[PDB]
Design a protein around this ligand. Sequence first.
Ligand SMILES: [Mg+2]
Ligand SMILES: [Mg+2]
Length: 453
Amino acid sequence: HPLSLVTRPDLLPPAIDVRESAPGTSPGYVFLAPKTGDPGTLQSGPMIVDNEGEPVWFLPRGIGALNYVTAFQRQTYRGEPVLTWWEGAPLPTGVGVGYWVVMDQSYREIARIRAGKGHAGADLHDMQITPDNTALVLIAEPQLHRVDGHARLVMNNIVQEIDIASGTVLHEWDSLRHVDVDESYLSSIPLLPYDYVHINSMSVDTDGNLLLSGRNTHAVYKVDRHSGDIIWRLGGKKNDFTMAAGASFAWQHDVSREGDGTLSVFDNAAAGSIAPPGTVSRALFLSVDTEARTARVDRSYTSPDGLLSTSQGSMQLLPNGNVLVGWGSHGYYTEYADSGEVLMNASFKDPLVNSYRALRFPWHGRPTDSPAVAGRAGAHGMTVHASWNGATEVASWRILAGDTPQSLSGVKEVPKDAFETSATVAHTSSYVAVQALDSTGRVLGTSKASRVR
Ligand SMILES: [Mg+2]
Ligand SMILES: [Mg+2]
């Protein structure tokens, strides 16, 4: 697991093993938020890696076990590509109270999305920036609710649509207001708040209505954007559609409408003893017929390692037709072709490290700092180390050497082959520096002059 970096001893990004990387893997980078279940004694935060698992960007923003990072992905705000992730405190039911960070391509925070007034914070499970520059945020707050005549404590879910610039709440959807408690499949703990629906995904369908994934009800709800009425229920105790054998899902995550028209559902299909022997989690693409009220499996993708993710997970349809799956509780992620052939299979070197999602996006990082450099003298001469956290366009490094910071001269150019590239030179100098070069040889940035040690 994380070996020391010479130029950045403050960064300890988790290591990843790519057991298979066949040709045809979609371009772009993989977005992860590694965590040690929670405080793991290892760094955690948003991470961007390449197809070899080598880190491209890593930002430690963990605060022990009182405040951690999850649900890292790329979104679009005001037509510009941005980074979003969640930070906050965990709760016993597995939900959290926190906020969402919005950061630009220069890696500075440009916005922070919080729950509306009157609520402690937003839940960690999902958040979606709409093309209307609004925020779909999930609030999970305990409320007293009369079930079977008994007053009980239940885990209510509120979905708010919030303008980013003003923070004003434009729409609000109360789950206890449309979904009954006895629709849940989860057994009742007498002291814990009854997490009856446990929404973990929010998506906007092609018609503008909302698609909400209820984990503990095994159901997907189509909600009118304005009136808040439930259009239909897919799965669960009040299912509107006819299901085949393997079309029914359970404890599912990450539901969205795809370009081909199918509905994507990550069927975890199990929980942690609170599943039939042999079941595996599967990535589901379903064709739903609203006229006949039926839904069948278009295609499904299973793990080559026979994994059964009891929680978390993600799926993504890539532009070339590939399917990228994040196995959630299991620290694996797999990219398939349409035919189901495995193109990329990767896992964290530490088995205790996992990520909520594993998504692929193109990214163009423009760091506002300078490259980091370090030089160590020796018998051969000098060994020069170079890194630039967040830089995506660096193709090679130019090594500068000189006796004074003002008399630096270029001695050697080497390709970038890792997050931190190391190269030796047959000379010994008093100062070294590096220049990051893109594929055409244009200079992207220059490090400070570093005294050789
Ligand atoms: Mg989302
Ligand atoms: Mg998805």
